[PDB]
Ligand binder design. Structure first.
Ligand code: NAP
Ligand code: NAP
Ligand code: CL
Ligand code: CL
Lengths: 354, 351
């Protein structure tokens, strides 16, 4: 056991010196000894970022490989052996892993309480994760997955979650993927608030509907925005009092309908969980004066949000949605255990085994 | 005077119907009658977005013009007459205007109090502003400016500022340019807070230093981050208690130095006012747990900030720096009037 490990993991950065593990080019993936504030994982499965997986697959096709599973497996071993991690060298994307705890340093900053042998999922990207792949058992070309024998390091600053014994693994992973959204909504929504959820039928959207309605309470108002009439029942069953039919890019219709439904008062909190571009101004205009607009979509443009609010004189607070929050996995999993409607929808949509 | 004008201005959108004035292709710039919630301006000068001005200049050269001032003037007349606004048709960029209030609709949402004749600057883009150019008097090729006779519409949702007749106009416009930064900093900093200002020697930075120190007070702590030791006296004179020398992209140095100056407690509030990319993670790591990180720079990447905080388990709030806030002009100008050190620096730097 090595001493004086950096919680941010800089002790494993080989190239270039003086940067963090994520932007680094080469990490130390020597698993024979760990630092005192690290956690070592026996990796079972690698869930590669879909864009990275597709980009690597197509690069290999273009180079002329016929056996794609074998070419991909060999690509992953070469990449991880040389750079210490599975960070896509063209996109910068990573992924996450599933495995069982192998060793815990005595100064590891424990978050969720876990012990050797526990089954866990990482909630930080493979783009900063020291990873040693000893064997690729299977490349699942259609699932962006590799079943492997290997090991990974979590730094004390990293994030992980114990996978619950009583839940379908893919169901649990689906909640963990978006756990930050309901966690943040719980912090934002006051009793009696009006809340507008843009993209309310989505995976994070239906979780946001439910905690928004729990937090806003009996005299609050939760308004979902969807573009498909097919989604109205689900939005209402998961917490929406009202549903607006609009493209999330249609600022005028959303403003008009939110105004109708609130008698001009508009929303205290706007939660944006769409996966498309140019929805910043429609979200801003749904808010009341000094309201809160929480942008979760990775499609959000900083400049479009900033210039959007300036051009129409909207004095609103606009937050970059932080996917991490203390206890967010436990909070999101507890939401599904309290709400049988959500649990049934999540199992139907995202459970592997039915 | 027509009634039931939309505060967002959709009643002047001709093409395509169903979008807002800024994304619209064609606006109605008929100034003979205004709507009840509009304000009509006699425009003196058009400050064209510099990139837009340069793109139009070069387009005209390539078409074969030679007398650029005259071709540019004719370009602006054709563009505004046809589309109703000076929105650059290739880039989408606009600009702002300076003018005198001509008429005030009876239902205009008054922000700062102005009456007919007041000298004002628009603080919203020419790309959403109905604009009629009756004459171009002078095209200033080195200044991205046109002196004109014409009129413009401010919607009730628009933003403007009265230009005080007692201050140099370039100085006033420079303050208006960054007024949202001190205004927003005033709301975030509590007494006894530790505040880190990244880019503390810049135009917005020195205003943020001063506001951070008055709000954090005698037992608060204001830390500037700059990369030049020559900037230290200015940072301290405008409010910093301590100054860190680091590149704003150097997350490890900034984290270590903020930790040193705060005994590991880190910053309650981080203000990022640099004009450089890849400073998100350094800003996040300067904050304490559940601290507030305010990104003012237009170089801020949404995904870099979100994924940055996620990867190191930083439960911090990250705010998109708005740039507009109620009364921001008045608040920033009052800061200069109350703080002789800032006024003197702003005078020397920004004419
Ligand atoms: N940082 C984090 O950890 C974090 C946390 C939560 C969310 N997020 C982000 O939030 C976004 C949503 O993620 P998710 O997993 O919830 O995705 P999802 O399940 O695909 O949900 C997206 C929803 O938005 C709707 N939508 C997209 N574009 C639309 C438009 N133009 N008009 C109307 N509706 C539209 C979709 O419905 P249609 O069927 O109509 O397309 C869908 O219901 C992603 O960008 C994700 O990265 C990130
Ligand atoms: N409209 C809005 O929403 C709004 C409002 C307020 C601020 N802002 C934004 O804030 C940014 C700054 O505005 P400004 O007018 O204050 O600009 P400015 O006067 O040029 O200030 C930028 C400051 O940052 C420093 N800096 C830049 N890169 C650095 C690096 N890598 N390391 C250390 N220091 C660095 C510069 O110092 P050096 O001399 O060392 O380069 C300079 O002092 C702009 O992007 C602006 O758009 C926008
Ligand atoms: Cl006219
Ligand atoms: Cl962005």
């Amino acid at each position: 056991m090595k001493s004086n490990g950096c919680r941010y993991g800089t002790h494993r950065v080989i190239e270039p010196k003086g940067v963090l593990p994520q932007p680094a080019k080469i990490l130390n993936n020597d698993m024979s000894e760990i630092w005192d504030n690290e956690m070592l994982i026996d990796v079972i499965r690698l869930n590669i970022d879909s864009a990275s997986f597709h980009q690597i697959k197509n690069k290999l096709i273009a180079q002329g490989h016929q056996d794609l599973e074998k070419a991909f497996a060999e690509h992953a071993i070469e990449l991880t052996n040389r750079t210490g991690k599975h960070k896509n060298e063209d996109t910068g994307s990573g992924g996450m892993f599933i495995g069982r705890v192998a060793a815990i340093g005595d100064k590891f900053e424990m978050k969720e309480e876990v012990k050797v042998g526990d089954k866990i999922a990482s909630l930080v990207s493979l783009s900063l994760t020291p990873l040693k792949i000893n064997k690729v058992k299977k490349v699942l070309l259609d699932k962006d997955q590799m079943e492997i024998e290997g090991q990974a390091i979590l730094f004390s600053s990293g994030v992980y979650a114990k996978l619950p014994d009583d839940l379908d693994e893919n169901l649990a992973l689906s909640v963990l993927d978006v756990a930050g959204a309901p966690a943040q909504v719980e912090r934002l929504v006051k009793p009696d608030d009006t809340v507008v959820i843009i993209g309310a039928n989505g995976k994070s959207g239906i979780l946001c509907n439910a905690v928004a309605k729990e937090r806003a309470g009996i005299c609050g108002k939760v308004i979902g925005v969807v573009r498909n009439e097919n989604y109205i029942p689900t939005c209402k069953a998961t917490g929406c009092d009202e549903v607006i039919l609009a493209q999330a890019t249609d600022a005028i219709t959303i403003q008009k309908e939110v105004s109708r439904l609130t008698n001009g008062k508009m929303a205290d909190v706007v939660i944006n969980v769409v996966n498309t571009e140019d929805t910043e101004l429609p979200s801003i205009m749904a808010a009341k004066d000094r309201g809160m607009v929480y942008f979760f979509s990775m499609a959000t443009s900083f400049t479009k949000a900033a210039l959007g609010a300036e051009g129409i004189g909207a004095d609103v607070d606009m937050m970059i949605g932080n996917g991490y929050a203390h206890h967010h996995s436990e909070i999101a999993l507890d939401l599904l255990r309290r709400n049988s409607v959500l649990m049934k929808i999540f199992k139907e949509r995202y459970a592997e085994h039915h």
